[PDB]
Design a protein around this ligand. Structure first.
Ligand SMILES: [Cu+2]
Ligand SMILES: [Cu+2]
Ligand code: NA
Ligand code: NA
Lengths: 621, 621
């Protein structure tokens, strides 16, 4: 069967068994990451070796281990002890989140700070947040979470409406010690509630919305075979799932007549970073890498039919490992369906008398994740005409603070006394390209303005220019919306019928990239987010733009170290890393629950096909 | 009844009668433009005076006239003779398009050019195109069209596949004279056909697409009263139609509790320009202003249910005048429906245990127009959360040329010997703002990066800055995607509950603007297209960014002359003019019929509301 098939409960139980038998999974051990490894480049002699990569944490303080396991042969391949003070800590465990509030509740410094605010400790929730790397030398080599407090007036109250500003604590979650409690002063706790299901806030619900029924009376046009292989309207792909990256698309290819033509070997969101722009000591450390530090797949929602996914939905229910190696199913974690997408092509020709209209549609593959106050949707779209699009949907409840009485240059006021610090949500798409095969190159395409003069006497001409990126050292590129800058991924050895190299064009949204000072800690750890486009030469171990162990790593790992190798990328197996993000200055309308905002990118064919690939679409029924 | 109601067949017949009785519409006269005038600013003492503006052409060569007519009182208000050599020619008449091919067919120079190419004149179609203003002094004061030739091998053949390059003719359509025929040389006529309904090209049609049924079992959630007044999900607006601008939105307002709050007084696409970037003498003159020169509303398609508009559709059938003053109905010219739009807001809260999901939807108002080879869709979207969005969809058949044998820097090759010149499609949105009333101002908002240092020791802070545009002379603005530049329209005298001015934010796509040399003819006539944003003080006669008479006008009219008045726009009745466009380097995939590409803009509330306006949306049925 397919080596790209989803992990099954049996494979995960068998990994647990192999590890136990090898002496690697005793009672002090916890699995912080488990995922299948992709087949090797040809080296994997077809056959089949289902290999799994495991990060094992030790709750007694011993060194963690990276282990690779073969479940086909039931053996441990390698087990390396990690020096986390050098190469970074493991991802946060779910059980460590719950520990922060409990420890703080019995710490004299925390209780004193709460008493000075006349707050009941049984009503104070603590958001446990990743720690980053700053000036505290005692944290190097230690698993640290930081806590910010919110008041919950009653169990169904939205705590985010009641931030306790001026207060932050740092917690060692392995030795279970409170290392620091910082109290810069008392701020009023905002009193208005933010309960968006309370009739007192919502008013009477609308009665004016009539139903929209979307049905497919003959079922959907896509087929699913082998659990996760999709065929739809000439597209072919495998839908993977990884506890860290979430949904991963493999082997995206398009059937152009008789031949299956590869386009993208692997597509994923390989990292995301959420940096905050509030210089207050209470929050100036606040950054999370939701993918690399928390593992966004682990927090995927079960998606409800008619609510989260409307229409004729096919579901995938991926299996991940819990902290002890037992399989855990995310029921209805992935939604797949096709959607009408308006007009595809249209022309009414006067001379021929032919009127022609065809409708477009797209395949949708999506999942949603929730981490704390944030909710992120990840949407991959495939269109009839060969376009591939990614869209992130950001929603949830904004992270709050007090609003200072004299105003602020870095915080929005949402309600009396209630602030929302400025922040970004930045994503890194990793696109292991395979445009008609693995010999690919990237060109930067700019519009070129021409001057009125000889050969252009009316001053109307304009053109474009393409610059080939030949080595990694020249392949760190910035957007330029004003010159219409795009990037083309082409195959110099595969030509269309016009004898031009086949290609795909990447259209970015040209949003601002990382705003932090280039000397900041976050600029070093999130270096990928400072540029719009990176191209690297493929390597099996270069998976994430931040490195493998993002939690509490000092920085520089990942992309800036990969590109220092200065490898040849001109007609080679290459990987495109695209940074794109939202800059969020929260508005009153984002409160008390925020409407979705979106960002993404798209790839459109650029002389990939010999003519329009949608000539054979029939007239609408 | 509403003074914003659509013109009726009776009103148009009555305009015809008034003009006839006044001696203004005899047999030598033709109506080149007819449209209702909007109610005056308060000055219109409610009551009702339905006034119509008429451009009357004279086919005997006498001077044309601008006439304003009151159909309520059955009188002519004013009739002015136009000096078209000074102020521009009238819009092209449909009957003048048909004249170009007929005249050329009996001209010895044209027949000689066709004979030298072994072409049969009965198979040569001539695209009649607007002329612009260049070096030919004989054209000043004359109605000129230029013709480019295409070969049609048989009546149902797509002529666009067979351009006759090296040949162009100029025609005086009033005296019916061929002024010039230019033959720069013989080019092979591309032989491959481009017939996208021919089974030989399409192959067997797909059988894999299963139906998508979109129904509203209880009917739609919007109501239509008075012919064209829409109420939908707290939105209120009137849908107008103008033969020049096409669909016009009036009185866009949102019901926020008890009060109806204005947002936009009038929204339209007030001009569009399609400049070509090929420096060949055969085409370097090629620019059209489809709105101002051709009148895009006049060429609106009748939209077929299930093909052009899918779902539960409500139709409007606008009435326009033909060239003699008879009413002509565009049946099913406007489609209106609501569409599901995925998730609106979502949060699963761990501390409260509440899981919350709400679905979004949008109201869609659209029309399609066809001029020659081009087909343009105009889409206005209203969303539950207060967002307003415009989207243009460009499709049709690309305008073609020969592909030169040595290559070209300004033309794409689509097929053997077949070129497609580079061009842009640029739109001007005119937004007569009324944010909570008519005292509005515009601010330019830029992201501000901050340096690591005192008060920002971790180097994470970032902020933003808003610059008020106080006079027209400072209100010609350029995009800056890198600093996240947007524009806020606010009402300094209307505050939200946080005592901040209410506002709306304009989010542009930041595509390139007009690429032509600033000294070119098109840069002067399409000056609006050289900048992303203009703000003017409202005036009843400042309707179009190019002026009233765009056909063969020398330039400088419209926006650059309006803003020279340097009026106060700080808390005044203002109008926002946003330029946005597509730069089209045609691809092989655009041939032989092109998939839709899109561009547009959106406005999102920015502290307009006191909290999220969609708290009262119910859970999905
Ligand atoms: Cu945000
Ligand atoms: Cu185009
Ligand atoms: Na690759
Ligand atoms: Na206004």
């Amino acid at each position: 069967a397919s080596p790209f098939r989803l992990a099954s409960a049996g494979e995960i139980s068998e990994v647990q068994g192999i590890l136990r038998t090898a002496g690697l999974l005793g009672p002090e051990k916890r699995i912080a990451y488990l995922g299948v490894l992709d087949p090797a480049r040809g080296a994997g002699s077809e056959a089949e070796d289902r290999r799994f990569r495991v990060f094992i944490h030790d709750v007694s303080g011993a060194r963690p281990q990276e282990v690779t396991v073969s479940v086909t042969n039931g053996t441990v391949i390698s087990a390396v002890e990690l020096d986390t003070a050098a190469t970074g800590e493991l991802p946060v465990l779910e059980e460590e989140f719950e520990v922060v509030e409990q420890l703080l509740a019995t710490d004299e410094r925390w209780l004193k700070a709460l008493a000075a605010r006349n707050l009941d400790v049984s009503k104070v929730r603590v958001a446990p947040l990743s720690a980053g790397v700053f000036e505290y030398a005692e944290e190097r080599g230690r698993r640290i979470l930081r806590g910010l407090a919110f008041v919950q007036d009653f169990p169904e109250d939205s705590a985010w409406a009641h931030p306790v500003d001026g207060l932050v604590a740092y917690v060692d979650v392995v030795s279970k010690e409170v290392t620091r409690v910082i109290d810069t002063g008392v701020f009023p706790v905002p009193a208005e509630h933010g309960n968006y299901t309370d009739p007192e806030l919502t008013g009477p619900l609308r009665t004016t919305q009539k139903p929209i029924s979307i049905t497919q009376p003959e079922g959907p046009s896509f087929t699913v075979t082998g659990g996760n292989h999709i065929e739809w309207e000439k597209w072919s792909l495998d839908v993977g799932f990884d506890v860290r990256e979430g949904v991963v698309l493999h082997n995206i290819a398009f059937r152009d007549g008789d031949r299956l033509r590869p386009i993208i070997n692997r597509a994923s969101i390989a990292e995301m970073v959420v940096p905050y722009g509030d210089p207050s000591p209470i929050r100036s450390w606040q950054n999370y890498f939701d993918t690399g530090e928390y593992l966004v797949g682990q927090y995927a929602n079960s998606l409800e039919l008619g609510c989260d996914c409307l229409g004729d939905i096919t579901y995938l229910s991926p299996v991940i490992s819990d902290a002890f190696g037992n399989p855990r199913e995310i029921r209805n974690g992935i939604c797949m369906h096709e959607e009408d997408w308006g007009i595809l092509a249209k022309h009414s020709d006067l001379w021929s008398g032919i009127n022609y209209t065809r409708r477009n549609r797209r395949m949708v593959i999506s999942f949603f994740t929730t981490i704390g106050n944030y909710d992120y949707g990840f949407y991959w779209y495939l269109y009839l005409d060969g376009t591939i699009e990614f869209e992130a949907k950001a929603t949830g409840v904004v992270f709050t603070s007090a609003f200072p009485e004299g105003g602020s240059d870095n915080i929005s006021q949402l309600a009396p006394g209630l602030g929302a610090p400025f922040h970004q949500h930045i994503f890194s798409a990793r696109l292991d390209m395979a445009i008609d095969g693995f010999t690919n190159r990237v060109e930067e395409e700019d519009v070129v303005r021409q001057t009125m003069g000889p050969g252009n006497e009316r001053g109307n001409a304009f053109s474009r220019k393409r610059t080939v990126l030949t080595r990694e050292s020249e392949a760190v590129r910035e957007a330029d919306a004003r010159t219409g800058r795009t990037w083309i991924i082409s195959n110099p050895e595969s030509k269309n019928r016009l004898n031009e190299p086949v290609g795909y064009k990447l259209h970015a949204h040209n949003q601002p990239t990382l705003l932090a000072d280039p000397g900041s800690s976050i600029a070093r750890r999130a270096a990928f987010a400072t540029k719009d486009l990176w191209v690297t030469r493929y390597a099996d171990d270069e998976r994430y733009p931040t490195g493998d162990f993002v939690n509490q790593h000092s920085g520089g790992a990942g992309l800036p170290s990969y590109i220092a190798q200065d490898r040849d990328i001109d007609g080679q197996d290459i990987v495109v890393w695209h940074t794109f993000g939202l800059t969020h200055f929260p508005r009153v309308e984002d409160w008390p629950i925020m409407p979705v905002d979106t960002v993404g990118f798209k790839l459109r064919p650029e002389g990939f096909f010999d003519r329009s690939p949608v000539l054979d679409v029939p007239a609408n029924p």
